[PDB]
Structures are given as C-alpha cells and as structure tokens.
Design an enzyme around this catalytic site. Structure first.
Site, PDB file in Angstrom:
ATOM      1  N   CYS A  27       0.798  -1.226   0.000  1.00 42.63           N
ATOM      2  CA  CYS A  27       0.000   0.000   0.000  1.00 42.63           C
ATOM      3  C   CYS A  27       0.835   1.284   0.000  1.00 42.63           C
ATOM      4  CB  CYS A  27      -0.939   0.009   1.205  1.00 42.63           C
ATOM      5  SG  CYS A  27      -1.877   1.538   1.360  1.00 42.63           S
ATOM      6  N   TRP A  66      -9.434   6.183  -0.632  1.00 45.84           N
ATOM      7  CA  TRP A  66      -9.792   6.770  -1.919  1.00 45.84           C
ATOM      8  C   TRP A  66      -8.899   6.182  -3.006  1.00 45.84           C
ATOM      9  CZ3 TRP A  66      -8.354   9.992   2.253  1.00 45.84           C
ATOM     10  CH2 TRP A  66      -6.999  10.331   2.292  1.00 45.84           C
ATOM     11  N   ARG A  89      -0.069   4.622   2.929  1.00 46.22           N
ATOM     12  CA  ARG A  89       0.042   4.359   4.362  1.00 46.22           C
ATOM     13  C   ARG A  89       0.389   5.563   5.248  1.00 46.22           C
ATOM     14  NH1 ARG A  89       4.167  -0.451   4.806  1.00 46.22           N
ATOM     15  NH2 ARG A  89       4.640  -0.040   2.598  1.00 46.22           N
ATOM     16  N   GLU A 112      -5.149   3.353 -10.781  1.00 46.28           N
ATOM     17  CA  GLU A 112      -5.917   2.134 -10.542  1.00 46.28           C
ATOM     18  C   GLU A 112      -7.098   2.020 -11.498  1.00 46.28           C
ATOM     19  OE1 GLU A 112      -6.174   0.882  -6.239  1.00 46.28           O
ATOM     20  OE2 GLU A 112      -6.004   3.058  -5.991  1.00 46.28           O
TER      21      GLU A 112
HETATM   22  C1  HEM Z   1      -6.350   6.337   1.688  1.00 44.39           C
HETATM   23  C2  HEM Z   1      -6.294   6.005   0.398  1.00 44.39           C
HETATM   24  C3  HEM Z   1      -5.543   4.829  -0.088  1.00 44.39           C
HETATM   25  C4  HEM Z   1      -4.828   4.762  -1.245  1.00 44.39           C
HETATM   26  C5  HEM Z   1      -4.654   5.873  -2.249  1.00 44.39           C
HETATM   27  C6  HEM Z   1      -4.272   3.458  -1.327  1.00 44.39           C
HETATM   28  C7  HEM Z   1      -3.479   3.051  -2.398  1.00 44.39           C
HETATM   29  C8  HEM Z   1      -3.306   1.711  -2.643  1.00 44.39           C
HETATM   30  C9  HEM Z   1      -3.056   1.181  -3.922  1.00 44.39           C
HETATM   31  C10 HEM Z   1      -2.915   1.985  -5.186  1.00 44.39           C
HETATM   32  C11 HEM Z   1      -2.946  -0.163  -3.804  1.00 44.39           C
HETATM   33  C12 HEM Z   1      -2.690  -1.140  -4.938  1.00 44.39           C
HETATM   34  C13 HEM Z   1      -1.253  -1.104  -5.480  1.00 44.39           C
HETATM   35  C14 HEM Z   1      -1.156  -1.838  -6.799  1.00 44.39           C
HETATM   36  O1  HEM Z   1      -2.190  -2.238  -7.382  1.00 44.39           O
HETATM   37  O2  HEM Z   1      -0.037  -2.051  -7.324  1.00 44.39           O
HETATM   38  C15 HEM Z   1      -3.153  -0.468  -2.439  1.00 44.39           C
HETATM   39  C16 HEM Z   1      -3.118  -1.751  -1.959  1.00 44.39           C
HETATM   40  C17 HEM Z   1      -3.509  -2.009  -0.660  1.00 44.39           C
HETATM   41  N1  HEM Z   1      -3.950  -1.135   0.263  1.00 44.39           N
HETATM   42 FE1  HEM Z   1      -4.099   0.740   0.151  1.00 44.39          FE
HETATM   43  N2  HEM Z   1      -4.658   2.727  -0.276  1.00 44.39           N
HETATM   44  C18 HEM Z   1      -5.410   3.490   0.545  1.00 44.39           C
HETATM   45  C19 HEM Z   1      -6.018   3.158   1.766  1.00 44.39           C
HETATM   46  C20 HEM Z   1      -5.917   1.915   2.384  1.00 44.39           C
HETATM   47  C21 HEM Z   1      -6.560   1.509   3.566  1.00 44.39           C
HETATM   48  C22 HEM Z   1      -7.494   2.375   4.376  1.00 44.39           C
HETATM   49  C23 HEM Z   1      -6.174   0.194   3.827  1.00 44.39           C
HETATM   50  C24 HEM Z   1      -6.588  -0.678   4.952  1.00 44.39           C
HETATM   51  C25 HEM Z   1      -6.813  -0.263   6.200  1.00 44.39           C
HETATM   52  C26 HEM Z   1      -5.286  -0.187   2.774  1.00 44.39           C
HETATM   53  C27 HEM Z   1      -4.664  -1.406   2.628  1.00 44.39           C
HETATM   54  C28 HEM Z   1      -4.191  -1.848   1.384  1.00 44.39           C
HETATM   55  C29 HEM Z   1      -3.935  -3.276   1.148  1.00 44.39           C
HETATM   56  C30 HEM Z   1      -4.121  -4.388   2.152  1.00 44.39           C
HETATM   57  C31 HEM Z   1      -3.511  -3.382  -0.127  1.00 44.39           C
HETATM   58  C32 HEM Z   1      -3.099  -4.638  -0.868  1.00 44.39           C
HETATM   59  C33 HEM Z   1      -4.248  -5.631  -1.067  1.00 44.39           C
HETATM   60  C34 HEM Z   1      -3.778  -6.858  -1.814  1.00 44.39           C
HETATM   61  O3  HEM Z   1      -2.682  -7.397  -1.546  1.00 44.39           O
HETATM   62  O4  HEM Z   1      -4.498  -7.352  -2.707  1.00 44.39           O
HETATM   63  N3  HEM Z   1      -5.144   0.886   1.940  1.00 44.39           N
HETATM   64  N4  HEM Z   1      -3.380   0.697  -1.719  1.00 44.39           N
HETATM   65  C1  LIG Z   2      -1.725  -7.586 -11.853  1.00 42.75           C
HETATM   66  C2  LIG Z   2      -1.607  -6.771 -10.737  1.00 42.75           C
HETATM   67  C3  LIG Z   2      -0.407  -6.121 -10.480  1.00 42.75           C
HETATM   68  C4  LIG Z   2      -0.306  -5.311  -9.356  1.00 42.75           C
HETATM   69  N1  LIG Z   2       0.835  -4.679  -9.094  1.00 42.75           N
HETATM   70  N2  LIG Z   2      -1.357  -5.166  -8.537  1.00 42.75           N
HETATM   71  C5  LIG Z   2      -2.537  -5.761  -8.778  1.00 42.75           C
HETATM   72  C6  LIG Z   2      -3.552  -5.592  -7.842  1.00 42.75           C
HETATM   73  C7  LIG Z   2      -4.691  -4.584  -8.010  1.00 42.75           C
HETATM   74  C8  LIG Z   2      -5.380  -4.784  -6.803  1.00 42.75           C
HETATM   75  C9  LIG Z   2      -5.731  -6.091  -6.466  1.00 42.75           C
HETATM   76  C10 LIG Z   2      -6.382  -6.355  -5.268  1.00 42.75           C
HETATM   77  C11 LIG Z   2      -6.760  -7.649  -4.900  1.00 42.75           C
HETATM   78  C12 LIG Z   2      -5.757  -8.681  -5.424  1.00 42.75           C
HETATM   79  C13 LIG Z   2      -6.183 -10.076  -4.950  1.00 42.75           C
HETATM   80  N3  LIG Z   2      -7.528 -10.431  -5.421  1.00 42.75           N
HETATM   81  C14 LIG Z   2      -6.656  -5.311  -4.397  1.00 42.75           C
HETATM   82  C15 LIG Z   2      -6.300  -4.003  -4.694  1.00 42.75           C
HETATM   83  C16 LIG Z   2      -6.637  -3.021  -3.738  1.00 42.75           C
HETATM   84  C17 LIG Z   2      -6.417  -1.594  -4.243  1.00 42.75           C
HETATM   85  C18 LIG Z   2      -6.786  -0.619  -3.293  1.00 42.75           C
HETATM   86  C19 LIG Z   2      -7.209  -0.921  -1.998  1.00 42.75           C
HETATM   87  C20 LIG Z   2      -7.563   0.121  -1.136  1.00 42.75           C
HETATM   88  C21 LIG Z   2      -7.985  -0.140   0.160  1.00 42.75           C
HETATM   89  C22 LIG Z   2      -7.496   1.439  -1.571  1.00 42.75           C
HETATM   90  C23 LIG Z   2      -7.074   1.682  -2.871  1.00 42.75           C
HETATM   91  N4  LIG Z   2      -6.995   2.926  -3.336  1.00 42.75           N
HETATM   92  N5  LIG Z   2      -6.740   0.664  -3.672  1.00 42.75           N
HETATM   93  C24 LIG Z   2      -5.648  -3.739  -5.907  1.00 42.75           C
HETATM   94  C25 LIG Z   2      -2.684  -6.606  -9.871  1.00 42.75           C
END
Ligand code: HEM
Ligand SMILES: Cc1cc(N)nc(CCc2cc(CCCN)cc(CCc3cc(C)cc(N)n3)c2)c1
Ligand code: HEM
Ligand SMILES: Cc1cc(N)nc(CCc2cc(CCCN)cc(CCc3cc(C)cc(N)n3)c2)c1
Ligand SMILES: [Cl-]
Ligand SMILES: [Cl-]
Lengths: 361, 362
Positions: free
Chosen positions: A65, A237, A68, A242
C-alpha cells in the site's frame, strides 16, 4: 498448543500496542486478565482501544500500500455486536455512506465478529462492496471480466443483472448456520459514480465511461494479536492509475485503449508511435479531472509517492522498520518518475496485518 | 581445491554445451583432455565452438535482459590472442565499427584473454565503450552525472574534456604489468550519434538533445565453465525507453522532463495534469522517430516485450527453465501494457552468465 499460540500472539501485540499508546504501565494487568480469559474460554476479546489501534497497525504494515502515510487517521467502526443478516446488511450500507461522506472520502473499516473455532460468524462473498458485474455468453463479453465468477454465483441464487457494462453487484454474504448466502441489491442513492470526461477533448464523453467513487475491499482477513477478523471491509480513496491504467485499460478488464486512441484522434497502427502510452496518459488525465470536477476524493500517483516518501521518513523518525512490496508500490505509469522505483524495500510480513483468504464460491 | 572447483565447473558446462550442440558423444574424450590440461597448467582452454556457444548461453541466462530472443545469433569475436595495448585498442575500435554496421546494429561480443590466477590480463575501465563524460565543480553540473567518477579518473591521467554536455570519454584500460591504464581518444568517424527530433513538434530540436547509437557494456565478467573472461565487451541495440525514460529523463541523469514539457507547450505546474507522464511519452516518441529516421536500429518496449514472450515460449518448447528479474524486465513506461507486468519470474542465477565486478576506480 492453540492456547499457547494465541497467548504468544496476544503477548506480542498487547506489549507493542500499549507502548505505542503510551500505556506501558497497563500491560501487566491486561495480560493477567487475558491469561485468565484464555484459560477459561480458549480466546480473548479486544478492548475498543486495542481493536482500533490494531486495525491501524495492520494498515501501517501493509507492504503493498502506497497510501500508508495516513494510517493513524483510519476510522474504525466496531460491529462485533451484530448477530442477524439485517444487521450485517445495514452495517455495510452504513459503511458505504459514511466512507463516501458526500465525496470527501473517509478511510474507514467496519469490523464484524471474529472467527471462533476457526468458524466464521459472517462470510462476505464480495471482493469489493461496490463492484461491476461481468458476463460471457458465446464469445460476447459484457461488463467487468474480473467479476464473472462472482456474477455467475449471484445469478445462481436468483439475482439477475441488466447486463449493462456497469451493473452494480448485490451485497452477498453468508451467516453462520446458513447453508446459502443472502443477497441485497444496493440502493443507487448510496453509490456515487463518476462519468469520465476529458478537460480538453469533448469527444471523450462519447466513450460513455464511468467508475464508482469508493474502493471498499471486503474479502481480506484482519489479524490482530492472534484474533482472526475474517469479515472486516476497509476503504480508502482511489489512486488515479488504478482506474485509468488498470480497471479501464487492462486487456483482461475493460480494455478501452484502442477506443481511447480513436477519440483523442491518434492512429493505433504502429507500436513505434507509442499510441498505447499516449492513450494511457490522456485516459488517466481524464480520470483525475473527472473525480476532481465531481468533488470526489482521488490522488495522482506523483502526489501519492510524495506522501509515501514522508511515510518512509516518518517510520525512520519513529524508529520503526519500514517494509514494502516494490512490485506493488510502483505505479503502472511513469514508475521511474517516482522515488519508489529507485530504491528497494524489505518485503517482510509484520503483524497486525491484512491477509488473503480462500473464496467461498 | 581450485583445480577441483575448476574441474567441476568444466564438467557441468561441457556436458550441457555439447548436448545442445548435438555432440554428446564427444564429451568423454573432451573432458579427458581437460582433466590432463588442468593438471599440467592449472587451467584449460575453450575451443572456439565452446567459447561461442558459452557466450550465447550467458546472454540466454541474463535474467535482466528483455532482448534474449535473439541469443543464438550473437556475433562472437575471439581475441584471446591479443598481447599488447595497441591490439586491445584496435580490437575495441573494430568492435565499435562492426557492431554499428552503418546503423544496422549487430549484437556482438569481443572476448579477450581470461584471468589466470585471478590475475587479469586486460582490465577495461569504461562502463560502456561509448559514453558521455560528466562534471561537477562548485554547484555546476555538466554532461552525464553517472560518468563523474570515471571522468575524474581520466582527467587524473592527463585527459581533458571540452566540458560540453556530450563529451565522448576515451577508451581506458590497463594491461597486465602496467601500474596505470592507458587511454585513447575515440575517432569520431567510428561513433554514430543521433540528434533527437520530434515527428510533429518542430520546436523539439531547440533542446539540442542527442544520444549515441550503440550501447556496448564493457565492465562485466563473462563466466564460462569456470573460466573468467573479465574483459569481454558486448552490445545490442537500444530499447527506446532506455534513452527517453532513463538516460535523458532521470533526475540523477540529464533531467530533461521540465524542458521537454516547455517545448511541447504544456504547463508543468500541477501533478494532476500528469505533465511528466505526457512529456515522457513525447520524448520517447521523439527518440524512436529519430533513430528510425537516421537508419539506426532501435526497438520500442511493446515490440520488445512481444519478442520476449516468444523467448518464453521457445524456452518452454525446449526443455529449459526460464528465469528472469521482473524489476528489470518491465519497461519504465506503460509497464502494465506488457505481458511481463502480469506474470512472475524465477530470479535464479544460471551459468554461463555475465556478472558485475569491482570498479578499479571508485
Ligand atoms: C487512503 C487512500 C488509499 C490509497 C490511495 C491506497 C493506495 C493503494 C493502492 C494503489 C494499492 C494497490 C497497489 C497496486 O495495485 O499495485 C493499495 C493496496 C492495498 N492497500 Fe491501500 N490505499 C489506501 C487506503 C488503504 C486503507 C485504508 C487500507 C486498509 C486499512 C489499505 C490497505 C491496502 C492493502 C491491504 C492493499 C493490498 C491488497 C492486496 O494485496 O491485494 N489501503 N493501496
Ligand atoms: C496484476 C496486478 C499487479 C499489481 N501490481 N497489482 C494488482 C492488484 C490490483 C489490486 C488487487 C487487489 C486484490 C488482489 C487479490 N484479489 C486489491 C487491490 C486493492 C487496491 C486498493 C485498496 C484500497 C484499500 C485502496 C485503494 N486505493 N486501492 C488492488 C494486480
Ligand atoms: C539485441 C538488443 C538488446 C536489447 C534491446 C536489450 C535490452 C536490454 C535492456 C533494456 C536491459 C536493461 C533493462 C532495464 O534497465 O530495466 C538489458 C539488460 C541486460 N542485457 Fe540486454 N539487450 C540486448 C542485447 C543484449 C546482449 C547482446 C547481451 C549480452 C550478450 C545482453 C545482456 C544484458 C545484460 C547482462 C543486462 C543486465 C545488465 C546489468 O545487470 O547491469 N543484452 N537488456
Ligand atoms: C535504477 C535502475 C533501474 C533498473 N531497472 N535498471 C537500471 C539499469 C539500467 C542499466 C544499468 C546497467 C548497469 C547497471 C550497473 N551499473 C546496464 C544496463 C544495460 C542496458 C543494456 C545493455 C545491453 C547489452 C543492451 C541494451 N539495449 N541495454 C542498463 C537502473
Ligand atoms: Cl479497483
Ligand atoms: Cl545506456
């Protein structure tokens, strides 16, 4: 064995939690209470203070994330008291409303009763509380492909989608004791959606693209001091990429880049024209513009990386080890323009944290 | 022990090499010869066939390289015969000319004598054979910052740069027996450079950007069957993003994105305008356009990823495990638009391969 495993997890968490809260003096008596509670019952119950800080620590420890920096301002809603599917439904409805906050999104988590015997009290089937359905019938794709299997499961239970590209999936969850899950249609008044327009290119609206305001992850397990909260949806948010670089751009998702290239008036004939790259930039510009225009919270990947840099600095200042997953922290467009790209991160797993769990369908 | 370590590496390599070449029957007699040679001399000498296939295998095993589809067409030049600095100089000059091939770049490696007792016969100081100098004197930055320490070392040996943003560094290398390296200025007739223009935006040339045609990595060690070729320069053609998204765009390199935004006529005031992203795309478009226009080989990151996908398939069609470094294989712009982004890779080290070694300066 299980009681000792639980006890050891509790000792570690309570000590850490209370130290951060400036209440180290209270640790001894609390552990005494927990020790006795585990002996009698096989488990223990978090205080509201422990639960709140636990959920915040878990966000802080989420390696993937980028958002954070704001971990300590998480809005934690304790619904360990719910016992009926109506109470679960209304709690989920309430989460959507309060997190949305008329566009000024509040990072929020709602925590339901934890596992008992490894027995789930509530079992949420949704990946996100708000999500579009997906269909595939004889070569014909409609909606979001990532939702195809959940959509099929819902329609097995008497739900039917309109088969637009943007059908809102119903809430679907199972109560302890029930063999089948129940489902509830989302009230449209609860769900903010954002039509995608471009600041300079009027033709962009011809694509008739839109996305929902709030990403609310509802299929992960929160682990805090040996207690397993399998049902605990959380939201932040969006980061613009994304939506613009993944959800709407991916070939296995909405796959819109060729149509984007057409409306912005460039050829999509040659790799060397970098038309996909150009289309991606304009689409992501459009997403950011549109959310801002409607008054819905969003962050661009440059600003987000800057915020994450401050999180790194904050971690160092507080003496905490920093952990992270480089492959998820880098944004999917212009990653090398961020500081993240140019350093490495320890991908160690620290608890409390959020974890994947098996899908029930 | 060393003879045993060497013997074991040779055993592994000869077996694999000869199997791929359809010469498994020759292994027994070859290893017998190697066994006797190691006993008498402390080392063994590769055949030209072993050396050629060895260098190709090393490229095939290079986890960080997206261009590996063409591993088997590597042009291998055997210069294990060189003994003088004039011969080294001329071999390096020759590599530049034959690899450049008037713009139709040939992937080439020139292999110099290997280490003996871990004693280097030739020690090349250049990171790449063609590279721009960099300077820093009381707050003033000139040229390529990545070259600052090598540039300083060169100027310690009597070289002096003109202090343009694009001074060509001299060839610099040390012969066994010499305390200091020698240096030789590059003949400009040998070095193809490409002025950067944009296909639609005439103002782009105001930036006066350019880059050199051929990337020739000259500071890595080729390891083949326990033999260490510390001096073995190799080249391919550029992927466009290397120049446009890293060399010219990086803040710690030429840092040109602000100036690019200005000439393409967009504001660089707000992160939410994604002006850096837009500037990056137009800069990379310009790089690809310019190399093609001049007739210098180049590949875009989409085409390169497609080729790499075929490399993966070819590996599977054979009996070979693949291996790769995801963090280097993904391109630095629109990575998620490639298949690479959406899968994972085993980053295990397989030999033969190319390895980092310590800089003799720094
Ligand atoms: C406040 C705004 C937030 C933004 C902009 C944000 C941004 C992101 C983004 C962009 C990702 C995906 C990264 C990717 O796809 O490569 C992510 C993943 C994640 N975020 Fe956040 N996040 C936010 C809030 C939170 C909150 C509130 C939590 C939990 C309390 C959280 C927990 C996580 C977790 C657990 C993942 C990974 C989930 C997975 O492995 O599938 N985030 N975050
Ligand atoms: C192919 C791929 C590559 C990559 N780097 N990341 C992804 C994950 C996108 C993704 C996938 C999951 C669930 C994966 C397992 N089913 C969850 C998220 C969460 C994104 C997110 C969460 C939260 C809480 C806030 C925010 N702004 N964005 C984002 C996929
Ligand atoms: C044919 C054209 C070639 C192209 C387009 C190409 C592409 C690339 C690119 C883009 C990188 C850097 C990736 C990044 O920075 O993220 C790279 C790394 C590498 N390539 Fe290639 N390559 C080519 C030919 C070769 C050849 C001929 C060899 C050697 C025989 C080779 C060996 C390597 C090695 C060793 C690295 C890693 C260098 C390091 O770790 O510092 N490549 N390649
Ligand atoms: C910060 C950063 C990130 C990243 N992924 N990759 C890099 C490396 C770019 C690079 C660096 C080196 C030397 C690293 C150790 N000093 C070497 C290369 C080789 C690029 C290359 C080689 C060849 C042979 C062909 C070709 N087209 N490109 C490319 C840097
Ligand atoms: Cl999402
Ligand atoms: Cl380079």
């Amino acid at each position: 064995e299980e009681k000792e495993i639980l006890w050891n997890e509790a000792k570690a968490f309570i000590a850490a939690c209370y130290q951060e809260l400036g209440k180290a003096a209270e640790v001894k008596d609390r552990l005494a209470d927990i020790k006795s509670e585990i002996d009698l019952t096989g488990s223990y119950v978090h205080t509201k203070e422990e639960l709140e800080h636990g959920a915040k620590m878990a966000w802080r420890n989420s390696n993937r994330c980028i958002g954070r920096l704001f971990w300590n301002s998480l809005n934690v809603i304790d619904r360990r008291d719910v016992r009926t599917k109506e109470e679960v439904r209304d709690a989920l409805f309430h989460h959507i409303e309060t997190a949305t906050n008329n566009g000024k999104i509040r990072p929020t988590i709602t925590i339901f009763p934890p596992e008992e015997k490894g027995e789930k009290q509530v079992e949420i089937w949704n990946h996100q509380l708000i999500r579009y359905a997906g269909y595939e019938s004889d070569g014909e794709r409609i909606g979001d492909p990532a939702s195809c299997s959940l959509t099929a499961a819902c329609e097995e239970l008497g739900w039917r989608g309109e088969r637009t590209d943007f059908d809102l999936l119903p809430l679907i969850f199972r109560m302890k004791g029930d063999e089948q899950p129940v489902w509830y249609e989302l009230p449209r008044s609860l769900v903010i959606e954002v039509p995608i327009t471009h600041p300079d290119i009027e033709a962009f609206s011809d694509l008739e693209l839109k996305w929902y305001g709030v990403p609310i992850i509802s299929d992960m397990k929160l682990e805090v001091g040996g207690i397993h909260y399998n049902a605990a949806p959380f939201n932040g948010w969006y980061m613009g990429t994304e939506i613009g670089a993944r959800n709407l751009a991916d070939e296995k998702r909405y796959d819109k880049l060729k149509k984007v290239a057409s409306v912005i008036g460039i050829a999509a004939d040659y790799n060397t024209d970098l038309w996909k790259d150009q289309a991606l930039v304009e689409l992501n510009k459009a997403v950011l513009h549109s959310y801002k225009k409607q008054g819905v919270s969003i962050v661009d990947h440059h600003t987000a990386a800057s915020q994450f840099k401050r999180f790194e600095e904050q971690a160092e200042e507080a003496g905490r080890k920093l952990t992270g997953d480089w492959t998820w922290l880098i944004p999917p467009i212009s990653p090398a323009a961020t500081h993240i790209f140019h350093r490495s991160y320890d991908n160690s797993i620290v608890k409390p944290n959020y974890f994947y769990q098996d899908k029930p369908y």
